[PDB]
């Protein structure tokens, strides 16, 4: 999507493996706010908005 009309994919009721995204080489920016990127796999959230 264009930024003015950005897409939102609500993510729920699933197992979120965040080590795949963080340890990937394909990403240049990976900045986390409010949580640390290396503790993501130990956390649970009610809902994720992608």
């Amino acid at each position: 999507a264009s930024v003015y009309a950005w897409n939102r994919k609500r993510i729920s009721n699933c197992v979120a493996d965040y080590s795949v995204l963080y340890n990937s080489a394909s990403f240049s920016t990976f900045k986390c706010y409010g949580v640390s990127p290396t503790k993501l796999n130990d956390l649970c959230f009610t809902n994720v908005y992608a």
Binding site: G34, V35, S36, T38, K39, D42, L43
Partner: protein, 49 residues
């Protein structure tokens, strides 16, 4: 209400303890009042703040 002098002392101490304990639920500007949630979510550079 005859023994109010003693009951008032008991009530004041009970209120003081309840107030002190309830202060642990305050954020004081932090992201969470629960210390375990902060340590579970953040690394030391942000957790210390």
């Amino acid at each position: 209400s005859a023994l109010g002098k003693l009951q008032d002392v008991v009530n004041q101490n009970a209120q003081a303890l309840n107030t002190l304990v309830k202060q642990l639920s305050s954020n004081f500007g932090a992201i969470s009042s629960v210390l375990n949630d902060i340590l579970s979510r953040l690394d030391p550079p942000e957790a210390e703040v």
